[PDB]
Amino acid sequence: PLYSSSVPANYSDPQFAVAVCNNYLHENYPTVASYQITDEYDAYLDMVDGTVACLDTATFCPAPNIRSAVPSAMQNTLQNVLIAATKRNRELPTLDSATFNVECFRKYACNDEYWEEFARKPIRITTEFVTAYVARLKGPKAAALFAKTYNLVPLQEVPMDRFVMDAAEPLATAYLCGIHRELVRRLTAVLLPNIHTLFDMSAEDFDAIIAEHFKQGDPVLETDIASFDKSQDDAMALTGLMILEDLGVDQPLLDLIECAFGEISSTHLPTGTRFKFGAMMKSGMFLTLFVNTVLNVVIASRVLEERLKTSRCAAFIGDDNIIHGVVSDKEMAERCATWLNMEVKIIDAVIGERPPYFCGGFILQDSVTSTACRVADPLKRLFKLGKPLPADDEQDEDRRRALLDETKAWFRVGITGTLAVAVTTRYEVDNITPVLLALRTFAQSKRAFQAIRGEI
Amino acid sequence: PLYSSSVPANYSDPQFAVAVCNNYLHENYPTVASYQITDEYDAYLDMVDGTVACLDTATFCPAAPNIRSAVPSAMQNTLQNVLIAATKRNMRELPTLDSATFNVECFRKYACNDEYWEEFARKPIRITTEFVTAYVARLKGPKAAALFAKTYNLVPLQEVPMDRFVMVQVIQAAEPLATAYLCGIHRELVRRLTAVLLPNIHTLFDMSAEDFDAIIAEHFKQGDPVLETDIASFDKSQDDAMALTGLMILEDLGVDQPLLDLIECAFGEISSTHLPTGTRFKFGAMMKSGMFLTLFVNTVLNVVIASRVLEERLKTSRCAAFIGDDNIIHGVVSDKEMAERCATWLNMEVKIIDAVIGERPPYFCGGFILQDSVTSTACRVADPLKRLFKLGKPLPADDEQDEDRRRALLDETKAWFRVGITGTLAVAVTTRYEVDNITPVLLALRTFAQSKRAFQAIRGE
Numbered sequence: 001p002l003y004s005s006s007v008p009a010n011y012s013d014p015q016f017a018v019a020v021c022n023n024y025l026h027e028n029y030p031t032v033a034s035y036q037i038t039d040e041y042d043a044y045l046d047m048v049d050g051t052v053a054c055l056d057t058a059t060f061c062p063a064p065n066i067r068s069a070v071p072s073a074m075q076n077t078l079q080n081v082l083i084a085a086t087k088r089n090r091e092l093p094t095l096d097s098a099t100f101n102v103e104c105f106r107k108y109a110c111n112d113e114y115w116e117e118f119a120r121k122p123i124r125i126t127t128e129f130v131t132a133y134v135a136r137l138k139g140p141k142a143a144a145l146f147a148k149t150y151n152l153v154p155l156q157e158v159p160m161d162r163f164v165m166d167a168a169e170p171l172a173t174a175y176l177c178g179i180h181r182e183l184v185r186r187l188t189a190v191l192l193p194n195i196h197t198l199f200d201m202s203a204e205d206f207d208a209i210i211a212e213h214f215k216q217g218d219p220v221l222e223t224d225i226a227s228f229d230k231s232q233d234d235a236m237a238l239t240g241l242m243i244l245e246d247l248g249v250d251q252p253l254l255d256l257i258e259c260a261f262g263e264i265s266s267t268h269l270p271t272g273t274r275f276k277f278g279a280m281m282k283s284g285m286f287l288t289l290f291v292n293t294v295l296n297v298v299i300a301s302r303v304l305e306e307r308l309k310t311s312r313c314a315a316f317i318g319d320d321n322i323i324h325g326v327v328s329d330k331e332m333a334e335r336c337a338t339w340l341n342m343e344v345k346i347i348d349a350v351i352g353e354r355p356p357y358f359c360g361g362f363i364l365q366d367s368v369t370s371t372a373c374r375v376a377d378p379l380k381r382l383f384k385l386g387k388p389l390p391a392d393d394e395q396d397e398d399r400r401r402a403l404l405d406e407t408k409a410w411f412r413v414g415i416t417g418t419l420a421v422a423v424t425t426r427y428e429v430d431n432i433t434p435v436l437l438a439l440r441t442f443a444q445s446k447r448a449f450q451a452i453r454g455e456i
Numbered sequence: 457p458l459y460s461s462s463v464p465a466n467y468s469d470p471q472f473a474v475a476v477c478n479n480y481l482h483e484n485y486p487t488v489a490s491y492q493i494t495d496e497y498d499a500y501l502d503m504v505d506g507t508v509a510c511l512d513t514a515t516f517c518p519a520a521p522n523i524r525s526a527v528p529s530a531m532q533n534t535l536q537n538v539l540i541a542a543t544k545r546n547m548r549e550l551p552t553l554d555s556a557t558f559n560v561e562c563f564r565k566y567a568c569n570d571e572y573w574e575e576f577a578r579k580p581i582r583i584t585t586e587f588v589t590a591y592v593a594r595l596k597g598p599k600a601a602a603l604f605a606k607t608y609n610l611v612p613l614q615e616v617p618m619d620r621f622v623m624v625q626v627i628q629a630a631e632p633l634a635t636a637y638l639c640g641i642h643r644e645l646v647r648r649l650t651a652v653l654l655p656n657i658h659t660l661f662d663m664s665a666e667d668f669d670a671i672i673a674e675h676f677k678q679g680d681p682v683l684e685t686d687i688a689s690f691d692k693s694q695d696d697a698m699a700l701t702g703l704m705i706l707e708d709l710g711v712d713q714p715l716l717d718l719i720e721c722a723f724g725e726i727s728s729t730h731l732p733t734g735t736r737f738k739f740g741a742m743m744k745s746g747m748f749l750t751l752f753v754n755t756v757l758n759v760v761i762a763s764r765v766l767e768e769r770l771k772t773s774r775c776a777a778f779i780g781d782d783n784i785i786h787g788v789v790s791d792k793e794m795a796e797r798c799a800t801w802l803n804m805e806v807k808i809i810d811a812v813i814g815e816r817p818p819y820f821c822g823g824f825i826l827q828d829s830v831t832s833t834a835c836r837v838a839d840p841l842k843r844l845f846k847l848g849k850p851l852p853a854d855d856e857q858d859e860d861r862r863r864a865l866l867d868e869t870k871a872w873f874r875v876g877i878t879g880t881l882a883v884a885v886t887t888r889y890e891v892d893n894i895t896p897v898l899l900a901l902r903t904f905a906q907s908k909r910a911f912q913a914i915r916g917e
């Protein structure tokens with residue numbers, strides 16, 4: 001209870017205090033990063049109904065939705081990848097673990113045809129892309145103004161010294177969007193054709209893949225990595241950096257990525273009254289989702305080994321996956337246990353009995369067509385609809401149309417019964433069908449949907 | 457692919473659909489519970505700067521600067537899962553009973569005296585007329601308390617019969633009575649836990665910053681080792697043996713079956729208030745009651761985990777402090793046997809951290825345990841990096857809350873600028889996070905705190 005005398009000091013202007021706080025966070029990124037960044041990720045993903053729907057309806061950097069009512073819990077994977085990059089430019093135990101991880105990823109998930117190309121051809125964004133990026137935002141005229149203003153020479157890579165920031169942020173935002181598009185394209189090239197990602201895939205196109213490969217009685221395996229804080233794991237971060245490098249993210253690109261994203265850290269104050277959801281925000285969130293998907297595949301590669309390679313159909317996006325035709329064994333369980341302790345668990349599901357789960361939905365067999373499909377989880381949706389929300393007529397209509405789309409799937413005459421069975425099987429709850437009927441009531445009109453929020 | 461034809465299907469009255477959703481969640485509690493409940497817990501706790509500040513400044517159910525934390529709350533529904541364990545209780549799950557019974561043995565042997573269990577077993581918790589009247593008198597004055605007592609036919613010097621507010625469903629005309637009753641349960645649970653815990657084991661259910669600093673000062677010296685068990689990654693709320701451990705210790709403290717029935721009945725009704733949502737969380741007394749009970753069980757399981765991992769080293773520690781998921785244990789250093797006990801039991805979901813006063817600062821409730829370089833006396837100082845992170849939250853205008861937040865920041869900056877604190881705090885922040893000298897941030901936050909006009913620069917516009 002003996003405190004020394006307190007003598008506070010301060011700056012002569014609050015704007016000095018703002019700049020000092022922003023500058024401090026800028027200078028100390030990536031070592032630390034504000035949790036407001038991932039809170040903003042969660043808020044955006046929750047508002048657009050999750051990862052796949054966010055990627056599929058991307059307004060700034062594109063390429064019925066797959067919608068999930070599961071709350072987002074994003075961690076700053078990209079921050080820790082950049083921490084690994086700084087540490088690389090002793091812990092050879094980490095290096096040997098990450099190297100083995102990359103070996104498993106290549107051996108069991110990838111072809112080997114493209115690594116030489118990507119090594120000699122790092123990712124570089126061109127004038128034509130960033131112009132077409134601005135053209136789709138504001139029209140052909142504003143893009144030619146954009147190319148003239150930055151002195152962009154046609155058919156040339158955008159010079160990196162044209163816009164580095166270690167205010168031309170429109171150019172930097174356009175460049176980062178080109179990086180994400182090329183990363184998705186290059187990852188799609190290396191992955192074996194039975195291994196699918198969902199960076200831009202509608203519910204109908206994914207359902208075509210499910211319908212083709214998933215039959216009644218088929219086992220489906222899931223690796224649950226929700227409890228594994230891979231974003232704060234040293235070997236995972238180095239694995240992510242290593243595979244990004246293999247895909248063409250060289251040191252100039254890494255420097256550009258760290259420079260651009262240190263600038264987000266500097267937009268801490270003033271806060272405003274709501275998350276601004278910038279286009280730069282979305283680029284960082286997209287890159288985080290990309291690395292998470294890769295690490296998801298890496299974990300499945302190391303745990304399943306050849307059983308992943310020979311799977312007839314395996315799908316990955318964010319932290320979620322399903323792997324057809326694989327049943328856990330004890331060699332598999334020991335590998336997963338000795339490597340990641342109980343941070344990652346293996347789930348054995350079966351089409352028609354113990355339903356597989358994927359992106360907040362059930363993999364169900366339609367009882368009329370005998371065709372498998374993904375159906376959104378109605379219990380999660382009901383939970384999500386309880387969120388108190390300020391009045392917003394345009395967003396209310398968006399949410400109502402999303403509910404309408406979901407209820408149309410629930411009331412397919414081959415789905416309603418097996419969906420209620422799956423919900424009771426997964427959660428041990430009573431028959432969900434009265435809630436299905438209630439939610440469809442809300443969905444059919446703007447007036448009925450208003451009952452969810454209530455008066456005032 | 458191929459979809460069967462969709463024949464969508466609805467009700468006519470939207471109010472009927474509301475009732476169906478509410479009744480469904482009511483009927484299927486505790487089996488499932490909406491995450492809106494724990495999102496509301498987090499929102500309330502973040503608003504009032506965390507667990508200790510929330511209990512220390514409890515508006516409805518309480519017993520100077522507060523122990524405030526800028527660490528975001530991530531609450532789980534521990535009380536839900538205790539009630540599931542109660543349902544499961546009323547042989548294939550024998551290992552669960554074996555594990556939870558061993559947990560309670562460890563809790564009793566290494567954290568408790570043995571004096572009170574017989575009394576609590578024959579005297580279950582029952583709340584009396586005098587408490588609920590005094591509860592209402594504190595809230596609305598002695599006139600309203602007498603009105604309250606007369607309305608419910610409360611007989612003085614007598615326990616409140618549970619048939620006055622629960623028929624098992626809560627009489628809605630007697631909801632104020634039920635909330636007053638649950639506040640009495642929390643106060644008695646805190647009293648009885650304090651009775652059984654060894655005197656060197658402290659909880660912070662009602663402790664000011666000054667009072668806790670007095671305990672830190674007496675016991676924590678320069679160079680003293682301080683152990684922490686990190687259970688933040690341990691999802692003890694959906695662990696079967698943890699939930700059953702919490703149930704049995706509640707029972708050992710006097711929560712018998714009628715009391716459990718009341719608790720499940722009252723909080724199942726909360727599940728039936730899912731819709732309509734309104735525009736913001738309403739908070740309110742029944743929400744706070746369930747949150748306090750969750751914090752209580754979490755604190756107990758926190759002590760349980762330390763008991764089983766540390767064994768006699770918890771018992772002989774000169775000072776161990778617990779609240780929520782956080783703890784510090786004076787004078788203990790991890791060893792191989794301890795790490796193996798922890799890993800074998802909870803498989804690297806609980807981490808043991810070795811701290812040292814003055815070199816690697818112990819961390820507790822979003823603050824550092826530091827030795828004042830001038831008084832040579834140890835104390836807790838709030839983490840300035842966490843506070844900086846928290847101030848970045850975009851917030852709608854609220855003149856009253858803005859002044860509350862500015863005044864709390866003023867108190868925090870006062871500790872940071874004690875002439876014996878600033879230096880070792882900068883070193884501690886750099887040691888913990890590997891960041892540059894935090895002192896410019898200390899000055900910037902003090903700038904915001906000095907006036908309402910300066911504080912407006914955080915939100916801007």
Ligand SMILES: [Mg+2]
Nearest residue numbers: 242243245246
């Ligand atoms: Mg390489």
Ligand SMILES: [Mg+2]
Nearest residue numbers: 222320321357
């Ligand atoms: Mg999964």
Ligand SMILES: [Mg+2]
Nearest residue numbers: 704705707708
């Ligand atoms: Mg007992």
Ligand SMILES: [Mg+2]
Nearest residue numbers: 684686782783
């Ligand atoms: Mg701790």
